[model samples]
Target: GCTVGGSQTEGNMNKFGTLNFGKTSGTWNNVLTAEVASAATGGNISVTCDGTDPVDFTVAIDGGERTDRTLKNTASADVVAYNVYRDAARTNLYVVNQPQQFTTVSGQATAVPIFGAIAPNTGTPKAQGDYKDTLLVTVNFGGAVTGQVDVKLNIST
Candidate 1:
């Protein structure tokens, strides 16, 4: 609804921008892929993000196998006790369902991965296989739903 004339005649224009996240639109379908090893602890798949505008939006993670800060297995009752972190060393815990939490402000904002070992008396990595789940990492701009990135977490034995 632009002001063209007194009659307000509608016109056409082109819109273009770069908000790419994953490797490509064909393979990921906007869903970034990550792998997890059952035998290892602290090994995780990393996903990267970049922005054309600084402080234009904020990112958050929600849904998928993440429940109570653990990425539970979808195919079975296997629960890999792990937590996603904002830093590579996992010093800062990644806040789930929280927007504007990642205040990196452009540049190469990387979502570091973390897969903690199974509890001593609880589940074990060997006890899990083909564990799968979904992660919805979102980007909000100006208090609006701007982008929601998909992260397909796959665990293997």
Candidate 2:
């Protein structure tokens, strides 16, 4: 058995990158009880988020229009539309400004997952470089301090 430890195991920042044509995903940790686990058999591995009835998490692009679903080129005028979904299948759209609700336990912690789905809209060739976006993931828990982090999405052309 291992002790439940956190905020002391990994780097303070999380980073990600991908080509302009493909997708990317990331695991953004949540509060309190986002813990590790061990198994009795085989190899051991687990990071569990305690369950709750529902909590609101909002994922939005930092500098672009929320409704457009695109990340604008930091060095050019070109912009590309994208999708952030709860599912890896990319079927359900995580609409901007809309609350993505999840369940968590009263005394345990959890995580917020952002699944990527990006196929740059056809027509109007994008300027070569990096078409970028920043995700300001905010978790609302009805307290003085909210859980938040910035995740950068770099789609390099």
Name the candidate that leads on TM-score: 2
TM, every model: 0.43, 0.49
Report the CA-based lDDT of candidate 2 relative to the real structure: 0.38
Q: List model 1 lDDT by residue over 113-140, tens digit each.
A: 3322222322223333343344544445
Clash count list over all predictions: 0, 9
lDDT for residue 22 in candidate 2, whole number 0-100: 31
lDDT of 2 by residue, 86-119 (tens): 5556666557656666544344444344555545
lDDT of each: 0.35, 0.38
Clashing pairs in 1: none
True-vs-predicted CA distance for residue 104, candidate 1, Å: 8.0
